[PDB]
Amino acid sequence: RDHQATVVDKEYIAPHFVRVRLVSPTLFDEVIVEPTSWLRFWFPDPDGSDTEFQRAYTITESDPETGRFAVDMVLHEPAGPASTWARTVEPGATIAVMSMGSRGFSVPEDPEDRPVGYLLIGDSASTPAINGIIEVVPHDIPIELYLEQHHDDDVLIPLAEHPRLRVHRVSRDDASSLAAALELRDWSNWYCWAGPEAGALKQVRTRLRDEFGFPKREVYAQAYWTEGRA
Amino acid sequence: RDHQATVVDKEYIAPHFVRVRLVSPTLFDEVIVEPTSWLRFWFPDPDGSDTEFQRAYTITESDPETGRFAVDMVLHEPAGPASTWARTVEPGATIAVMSMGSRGFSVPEDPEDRPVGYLLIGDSASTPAINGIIEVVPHDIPIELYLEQHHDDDVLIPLAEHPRLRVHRVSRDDASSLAAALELRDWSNWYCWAGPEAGALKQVRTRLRDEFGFPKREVYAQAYWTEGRA
Numbered sequence: 001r002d003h004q005a006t007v008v009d010k011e012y013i014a015p016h017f018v019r020v021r022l023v024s025p026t027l028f029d030e031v032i033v034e035p036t037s038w039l040r041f042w043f044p045d046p047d048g049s050d051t052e053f054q055r056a057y058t059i060t061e062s063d064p065e066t067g068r069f070a071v072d073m074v075l076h077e078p079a080g081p082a083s084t085w086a087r088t089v090e091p092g093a094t095i096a097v098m099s100m101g102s103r104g105f106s107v108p109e110d111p112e113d114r115p116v117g118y119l120l121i122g123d124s125a126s127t128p129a130i131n132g133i134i135e136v137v138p139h140d141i142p143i144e145l146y147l148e149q150h151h152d153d154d155v156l157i158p159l160a161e162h163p164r165l166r167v168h169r170v171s172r173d174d175a176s177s178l179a180a181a182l183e184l185r186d187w188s189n190w191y192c193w194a195g196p197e198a199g200a201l202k203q204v205r206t207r208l209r210d211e212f213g214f215p216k217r218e219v220y221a222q223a224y225w226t227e228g229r230a
Numbered sequence: 231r232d233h234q235a236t237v238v239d240k241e242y243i244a245p246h247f248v249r250v251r252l253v254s255p256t257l258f259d260e261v262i263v264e265p266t267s268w269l270r271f272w273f274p275d276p277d278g279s280d281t282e283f284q285r286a287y288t289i290t291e292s293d294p295e296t297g298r299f300a301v302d303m304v305l306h307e308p309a310g311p312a313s314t315w316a317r318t319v320e321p322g323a324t325i326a327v328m329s330m331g332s333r334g335f336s337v338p339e340d341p342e343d344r345p346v347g348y349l350l351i352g353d354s355a356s357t358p359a360i361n362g363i364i365e366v367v368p369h370d371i372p373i374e375l376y377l378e379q380h381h382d383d384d385v386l387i388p389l390a391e392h393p394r395l396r397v398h399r400v401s402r403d404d405a406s407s408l409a410a411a412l413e414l415r416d417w418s419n420w421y422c423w424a425g426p427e428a429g430a431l432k433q434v435r436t437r438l439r440d441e442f443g444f445p446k447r448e449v450y451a452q453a454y455w456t457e458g459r460a
């Protein structure tokens with residue numbers, strides 16, 4: 001079930017990173033926001049037709065009592081309907097939103113059931129999701145963050161703070177760069193959350209399973225976008 | 231004159247080796263970056279007072295058009311105000327920086343005026359400076375690199391690539407270990423750049439002059455730190 005949402009504000013978090021604030025009073029009814037919770041939007045055709053384009057974006061602000069919420073959107077090159085929308089939308093615009101397909105992230109209750117560390121892999125598009133994860137990881141658990149870099153402005157996108165976060169930025173030469181940048185160490189009992197580009201995710205998953213020995217139950221991997229395709 | 235710099239990013243190049251990225255548009259108004267160029271930072275008191283502590287760090291990244299730059303910092307043991315800062319600083323923090331007393335490294339333009347080889351001596355603290363040197367040494371000039379080792383993780387600190395680079399690692403038993411490790415060979419017309427610990431440098435200089443026959447003008451020696459002293 002979709003809901004209509006009205007844009008109320010727009011803030012430039014980084015030069016190519018736009019936070020769009022909306023309101024949808026019935027959206028969060030029985031829908032609890034978790035780390036990496038996301039929404040489907042039906043974005044308008046920039047060229048003016050009635051065709052709409054469904055894209056996914058992570059929730060970065062939420063107030064269930066008012067239905068106010070926000071999403072952070074990368075202004076990527078080349079552009080698409082959603083990033084064009086982020087660039088040009090003004091408060092007062094409306095858009096249909098839906099919550100369906102989103103599984104949350106959670107740290108186990110028992111400390112002795114928790115991973116001995118989190119391996120987070122993504123880029124600018126999954127930084128909202130990864131930031132939500134970092135904000136809930138206990139302070140005594142280390143975090144190895146790998147961010148595939150596409151522009152110099154990427155370093156300006158704010159990251160969540162954590163006392164045991166170690167950040168690694170990866171220059172993308174091809175789809176093999178992200179998997180090759182991963183440190184070869186002991187990954188025993190670690191948990192991996194990966195939301196990178198589709199072509200890079202393929203070679204990342206292969207490395208996690210075969211070389212790093214990650215079990216399936218300790219990996220969540222979803223392609224957040226695809227190079228050269230919608 | 232100092233300039234205010236804002237921290238924009240932090241990356242863990244090695245487990246005890248942190249690259250801190252900053253921005254300061256006015257810094258590169260009168261500063262030209264050369265190999266081994268360094269800056270003076272006024273680090274804050276980790277204990278929370280108004281006292282500041284001036285320390286030197288090598289420029290590893292620089293963009294004069296935007297004012298963005300980076301330094302690589304060793305997380306040493308025992309810690310000091312600067313390495314504590316490297317461990318604990320978050321993006322958005324500010325710090326005063328100054329360029330004063332920094333002389334660069336250069337290779338003679340005339341090939342017949344160039345050294346027949348480069349003898350590079352240092353450790354993790356002078357590895358950013360040494361890397362900058364390696365990157366500009368012509369491919370037909372051999373490089374003999376000696377790095378005094380303090381921890382096993384020191385081999386994880388990336389070195390610059392060079393077709394004629396030969397690396398030698400030295401375990402430190404005392405201030406005499408580094409000098410004794412140097413190979414006794416013909417060093418005629420070689421050039422030496424040395425930035426090790428102060429006590430080790432004293433005995434290195436003596437061996438360069440008294441035993442290896444290095445002229446004073448073919449040697450650059452600068453102590454980068456002192457054992458048991460701030």
Ligand SMILES: Cc1cc2nc3c(=O)[nH]c(=O)nc-3n(C[C@H](O)[C@H](O)[C@H](O)COP(=O)(O)OP(=O)(O)OC[C@H]3O[C@@H](n4cnc5c(N)ncnc54)[C@H](O)[C@@H]3O)c2cc1C
Nearest residue numbers: 056057058073074076080081082083125225226227228230
């Ligand atoms: C669960 C989920 C959550 C997501 N959350 C976010 C979020 O919070 N913030 C965010 O910015 N993105 C997020 N994404 C990714 C976003 O949906 C994609 O980037 C999407 O393709 C952008 O839609 P678009 O209309 O702008 O471009 P599209 O029409 O899909 O593609 C047009 C062109 O732009 C390229 N392109 C698309 N995205 C990128 C990109 N990041 N970087 C470089 N090039 C790109 C494409 O390769 C293509 O060539 C999420 C994806 C998923 C699956």
Ligand SMILES: Cc1cc2nc3c(=O)[nH]c(=O)nc-3n(C[C@H](O)[C@H](O)[C@H](O)COP(=O)(O)OP(=O)(O)OC[C@H]3O[C@@H](n4cnc5c(N)ncnc54)[C@H](O)[C@@H]3O)c2cc1C
Nearest residue numbers: 286287288303304306310311312313355456457458459460
């Ligand atoms: C021109 C110049 C450029 C330099 N560039 C760099 C650079 O790019 N990256 C870098 O990491 N360092 C660099 N150094 C060395 C750095 O300035 C010293 O390590 C400095 O002492 C660090 O300041 P601190 O506050 O962390 O420790 P301090 O307060 O000075 O000393 C605290 C304690 O830690 C010890 N200690 C200090 N440094 C080290 C060290 N490397 N290894 C082991 N023990 C140490 C000291 O002996 C002392 O006991 C440079 C020095 C010079 C002169």
